[PDB]
Each structure stands twice: as structure tokens, then as C-alpha cells.
Amino acid sequence: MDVMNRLILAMDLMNRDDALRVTGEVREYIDTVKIGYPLVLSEGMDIIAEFRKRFGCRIIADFKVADIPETNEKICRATFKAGADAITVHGFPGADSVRACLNVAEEMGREVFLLTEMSHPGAEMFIQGAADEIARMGVDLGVKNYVGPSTRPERLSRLREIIGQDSFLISPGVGAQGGDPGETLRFADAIIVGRSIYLADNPAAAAAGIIESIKDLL
Amino acid sequence: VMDVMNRLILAMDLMNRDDALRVTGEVREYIDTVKIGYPLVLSEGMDIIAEFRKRFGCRIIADFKVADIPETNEKICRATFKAGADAITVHGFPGADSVRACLNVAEEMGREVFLLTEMSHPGAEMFIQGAADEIARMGVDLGVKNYVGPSTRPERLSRLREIIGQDSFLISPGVGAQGGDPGETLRFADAIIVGRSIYLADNPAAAAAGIIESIKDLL
Ligand SMILES: O=c1cc(O)n([C@@H]2O[C@H](COP(=O)(O)O)[C@@H](O)[C@H]2O)c(=O)[nH]1
Ligand SMILES: O=c1cc(O)n([C@@H]2O[C@H](COP(=O)(O)O)[C@@H](O)[C@H]2O)c(=O)[nH]1
Numbered sequence: 301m302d303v304m305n306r307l308i309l310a311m312d313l314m315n316r317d318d319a320l321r322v323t324g325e326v327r328e329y330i331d332t333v334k335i336g337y338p339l340v341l342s343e344g345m346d347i348i349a350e351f352r353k354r355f356g357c358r359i360i361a362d363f364k365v366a367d368i369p370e371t372n373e374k375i376c377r378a379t380f381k382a383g384a385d386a387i388t389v390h391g392f393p394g395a396d397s398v399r400a401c402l403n404v405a406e407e408m409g410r411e412v413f414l415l416t417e418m419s420h421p422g423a424e425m426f427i428q429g430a431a432d433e434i435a436r437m438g439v440d441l442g443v444k445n446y447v448g449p450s451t452r453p454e455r456l457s458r459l460r461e462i463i464g465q466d467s468f469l470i471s472p473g474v475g476a477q478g479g480d481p482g483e484t485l486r487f488a489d490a491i492i493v494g495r496s497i498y499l500a501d502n503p504a505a506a507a508a509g510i511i512e513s514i515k516d517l518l
Numbered sequence: 519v520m521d522v523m524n525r526l527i528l529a530m531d532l533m534n535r536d537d538a539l540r541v542t543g544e545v546r547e548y549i550d551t552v553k554i555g556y557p558l559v560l561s562e563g564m565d566i567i568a569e570f571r572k573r574f575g576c577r578i579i580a581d582f583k584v585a586d587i588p589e590t591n592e593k594i595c596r597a598t599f600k601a602g603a604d605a606i607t608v609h610g611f612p613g614a615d616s617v618r619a620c621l622n623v624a625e626e627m628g629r630e631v632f633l634l635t636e637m638s639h640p641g642a643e644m645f646i647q648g649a650a651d652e653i654a655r656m657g658v659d660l661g662v663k664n665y666v667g668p669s670t671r672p673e674r675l676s677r678l679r680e681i682i683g684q685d686s687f688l689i690s691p692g693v694g695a696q697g698g699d700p701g702e703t704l705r706f707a708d709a710i711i712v713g714r715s716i717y718l719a720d721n722p723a724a725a726a727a728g729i730i731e732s733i734k735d736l737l
Contacts, residue, residue, distance in 0.1 A: 422613020
């Protein structure tokens with residue numbers, strides 16, 4: 301996956317007008333947008349097609365699928381019908397649940413991103429201790445795309461070690477949560493950035509600034 | 519706690535609005551509590567919650583298994599409650615801050631959180647099962663009153679009931695299609711969740727009635 305400027309916009313604004321306006325303001329800097337439940341549950345799944353129509357960007361549906369296999373299949377089917385290019389999936393619920401998503405993605409010509417360790421403090425309680433094993437599970441299952449935490453570069457580096465250089469790794473927690481763009485790109489292929497851009501006084505300048513700081517990495 | 523008619527909650531996971539409405543309408547005399555998840559919501563929109571309220575006068579549990587960072591969790595809960603859901607399900611495995619974020623919104627908005635502890639499917643054994651007792655204990659410490667646990671593992675459902683105590687509310691999926699028994703499950707759970715056994719039946723009303731007949735002495 302070829303992500304422009306190694307930068308993925310996390311569009312978690314919950315108003316259609318604002319989400320489209322801000323995305324439009326930074327369109328020259330990105331070609332990949334992560335759309336999650338905040339926007340989708342506020343504005344409907346039709347928002348995905350609207351983004352493709354307006355920007356032609358790739359869309360990662362960040363739904364962190366975390367149900368039983370039978371339900372996971374339905375969620376993936378509905379999500380890809382709406383035009384998402386990829387979907388995020390929790391690994392914690394186990395291999396059968398991940399495989400359900402992989403099956404639908406294969407059928408519909410899409411990608412699964414396996415979420416291993418999360419970026420927030422609570423991830424330390426249960427997820428972190430399982431994360432290496434979740435990553436190995438991904439490798440066993442043939443998963444090629446992964447998500448890991450900007451806020452813990454030592455953990456992000458470990459995840460990269462496990463999945464290898466051929467796998468694709470994207471990483472949230474940059475900016476607002478404290479992660480550094482350049483340090484994160486030592487290990488991740490692309491960074492995910494939400495609030496630092498979409499809540500900025502000037503989102504275009506925010507995006508441009510981030511890219512300037514990583515210019516030697518592009 | 520919510521007063522669930524016949525101790526039976528319909529898992530409405532049909533993805534077509536017309537079929538979902540038909541089947542729910544057919545079993546409405548038996549069930550006043552419906553669980554609506556992402557299969558139906560992602561297919562038909564959050565307005566489906568509105569349509570169910572308008573048509574049936576059933577309580578709605580939004581089974582969204584919220585599993586994000588605290589800030590995103592808050593947004594998901596707000597949007598879900600804005601749409602009219604009585605309650606939302608939340609994963610415990612992302613940790614206490616993520617659960618607390620949901621509890622705070624539910625408190626502010628006058629609604630309820632159901633904490634998902636152990637899951638019912640085979641994959642749950644890999645990571646969730648080993649964390650489930652602690653997730654439950656965490657829920658108790660956080661003041662969580664409502665919980666979800668697995669019909670497919672009676673021994674685990676029993677232990678989870680012990681941890682949360684008799685005053686907590688416990689609902690349990692995995693009944694029917696996944697192999698769990700209605701009566702056995704109601705030894706521990708306040709209500710059973712049933713999806714395919716009802717909604718794929720040639721006569722969903724007869725299917726619901728049959729389940730209820732089988733647990734009549736437990737009502
Ligand atoms: O571990 C993770 C996994 C995520 O998907 N995310 C997501 O990435 C985005 C981070 O946005 P922000 O830059 O505003 O912190 C949010 O949409 C969040 O749900 C995360 O923050 N941590
Ligand atoms: O551990 C769990 C938690 C659930 O919410 N569920 C949900 O409960 C329902 C079970 O439906 P069914 O009776 O068709 O197996 C589905 O909506 C599923 O997503 C589950 O099966 N196991």
C-alpha cells in the first residue's frame with residue numbers, strides 16, 4: 301500500500317460538513333483517510349462513498365472488529381459494501397475471529413489490518429502482555445497489515461521485528477497522545493494523525509508542518 | 519435492573535431492514551428487549567434504532583462492543599445514545615480507562631453500559647478467557663452493574679456470576695446455534711440472548727415460544 305507522505309488522516313470529526321471541509325483542506329498532503337465509528341455512526345455509511353467521490357482517497361474503515369466469527373463476517377461484508385478499501389480487526393478475540401475477516405476481505409478484494417497493541421494507557425492491563433503472541437498469530441494466519449502504538453516505540457519496534465520488513469505497519473498515537481512523527485516512522489510505514497490536524501486552528505499548516513518534520517524520511 | 523420480558527433478548531442480526539422488521543414484529547409478544555448490532559446498523563443506518571422504537575416499543579441494547587481508546591470510546595457512546603439506544607456493550611480487554619470513558623458518557627446521558635467479559639466462541643480461549651476474571655473484577659471496581667458472559671461455558675459463566683455478585687445484571691449469548699442450553703444458562707444469567715435459533719426459523723414466533731415453554735418454571 302502506497303500512502304502519500306507516509307501520513308494517514310484520522311477523520312474523527314462527527315459532522316459531515318466539518319469532516320469534508322477539513323479533509324478538503326489537507327487533500328494535497330494525503331491520499332489515505334481512516335474513517336471510524338465517530339463519523340460513521342453520526343453521518344452514515346454513505347460517507348465512505350462521499351469521500352471516494354470527492355477526494356478519490358483510499359479509505360480504511362477503523363472498526364476494530366471484535367465479535368464472534370459469524371458476526372465478524374457480517375460486519376466486514378457491510379463495511380466493504382460501503383466501499384472501504386480495508387478494515388481494522390482486533391486480534392484479542394482470537395484466530396477464528398480474525399480468519400472470518402480475512403475470508404471476506406479476500407472475497408471482496410480488500411485488506412485486513414490487525415490491531416496488535418493499542419496506544420492508550422489502558423493497553424498495559426491486558427493487551428500489551430498478549431501483543432507479541434497476537435502478532436505471531438497474524439504471521440501464522442498470513443496477515444500482511446498491522447497496527448501498533450506510536451506511544452511506545454520500543455513496543456512498535458518489537459512488533460516490526462515479529463512481522464518482518466515485508467509486512468505493512470501503520471501507527472496511531474502521534475501528536476495528541478504524545479508520539480513523535482519521525483521516531484514512529486523508524487518502524488512504521490505510515491503514521492496515523494487525528495487531532496493534531498483536525499483540531500488545529502489551521503489543519504493545512506498542521507499537516508504541512510508534520511510533513512516538513514519528516515521530509516528526510518519521504 | 520431492566521425488566522426483560524421472559525428473560526429472553528432477541529439478537530437481531532438480519533441485515534435487511536424489511537426482514538429485521540418482520541421478524542422482530544412477529545416475536546414482539548414474547549420479547550420486549552432487542553439487541554441490535556453492527557450487522558444491522560452498518561447495513562441500514564443508526565436510524566434503525568429509531569424505527570424499532572417507533573414500531574415495537576422494545577428496549578434497545580446497541581451491541582457495539584466498544585473497543586477503542588478513551589477519547590474515541592466517548593464519541594462512539596455519545597453518537598449511540600443520541601440515536602436512542604438504552605444501553606451499549608463495551609469490551610473490557612482494552613483496560614480500565616477505556617471502560618471508564620464509556621461509563622462517564624452513560625452516566626451523563628442517563629443510559630447503561632454492559633461490560634463484555636468472556637466471549638462465547640472458540641477463539642475466546644486464546645486470550646480473553648485468561649483475562650476474563652480480572653476484567654470482571656475490574657468492572658466491579660469501576661461500578662459496572664451490567665455484564666455479558668458466555669452460555670457455551672457454564673463453568674465460566676458460573677464463575678463470572680460469582681465475581682460480579684447476585685445484585686449485578688448478567689446476560690448471556692451462545693444459546694441455541696452455538697450450543698448453549700436456555701435453562702442451564704438461566705441458572706446464572708438473568709437473561710439469555712438468542713439470535714439465529716429465532717431469526718432463521720421458519721416460524722420465529724413458534725421458535726421463541728418454544729424456548730420460553732422450555733424455561734417456563736424459571737420465569
Ligand atoms: O491503538 C490505537 C488504535 C487506533 O486505531 N487508534 C485510533 O487512531 C486515532 C488517533 O487519533 P489522534 O491522533 O486524535 O489521537 C483515533 O481514530 C483512534 O481511535 C488509536 O488512537 N490507538
Ligand atoms: O460472546 C459473545 C458476545 C456476543 O455479543 N455475542 C453476540 O450474541 C449473538 C449470538 O447470536 P446467535 O444466537 O445467532 O449465536 C450475536 O449477535 C453475537 O454477535 C456472542 O455471540 N458471543
